[PDB]
Write a protein that binds this ligand. Structure first.
Ligand SMILES: O=C(N[C@H](c1ccc(-c2ccccc2)cc1)c1cccs1)[C@H]1CCCNC1
Length: 137
């Protein structure tokens, strides 16, 4: 096992009808197929579940790249910090954002996330898709 193990991504949205999450321990190619649904205008946060196993890690960063076909990447970096080893997993949450609204805002966005640190270590790099819809269905 590695020192840092990213286990789960969750979109914390209080107005959502059900859970919006994805297991990050399985196959990484199957993650692209899975599409995450977010109603337009919804307030949300990105939650990263991860474990520290042996030693204190420092300088953790969450890096998120959002792609729409034919558009320049929308980048965002979040400082995660230092964490010590323990059996229970940790939870890092981004600040609240508001998903865009309107027909021009609806559609599927292609995300590539990076859980890394100051040492540019690849704790986990994965792809996932987010669909902005007029309603939750
Ligand atoms: O719509 C915006 N950016 C969008 C976007 C859409 C969705 C996300 C996302 C990804 C992952 C999770 C949650 C949400 C991220 C960005 C675009 C990206 C690339 C080309 S446009 C502006 C307008 C108002 C809201 N703040 C930013």
């Amino acid at each position: 096992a590695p020192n840092v193990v990213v286990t789960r991504l969750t979109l914390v949205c209080e107005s959502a009808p059900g859970p919006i999450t994805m297991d990050l321990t399985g196959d990484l190619e199957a993650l692209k197929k899975e599409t995450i649904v977010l109603k337009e205008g919804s307030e949300y946060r990105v939650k990263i579940h991860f474990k520290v196993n042996r030693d204190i890690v420092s300088g953790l960063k969450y890096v998120q790249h959002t792609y729409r076909t034919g558009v320049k990447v929308d980048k965002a970096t979040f400082m995660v910090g230092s964490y010590g080893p323990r059996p229970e997993e940790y939870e890092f949450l981004t600040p609240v954002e508001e998903a865009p609204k309107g027909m021009l805002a609806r559609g599927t966005y292609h995300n590539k996330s990076f859980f890394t640190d100051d040492d540019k270590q690849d704790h986990l790099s994965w792809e996932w898709n987010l669909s902005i819809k007029k309603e939750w269905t």
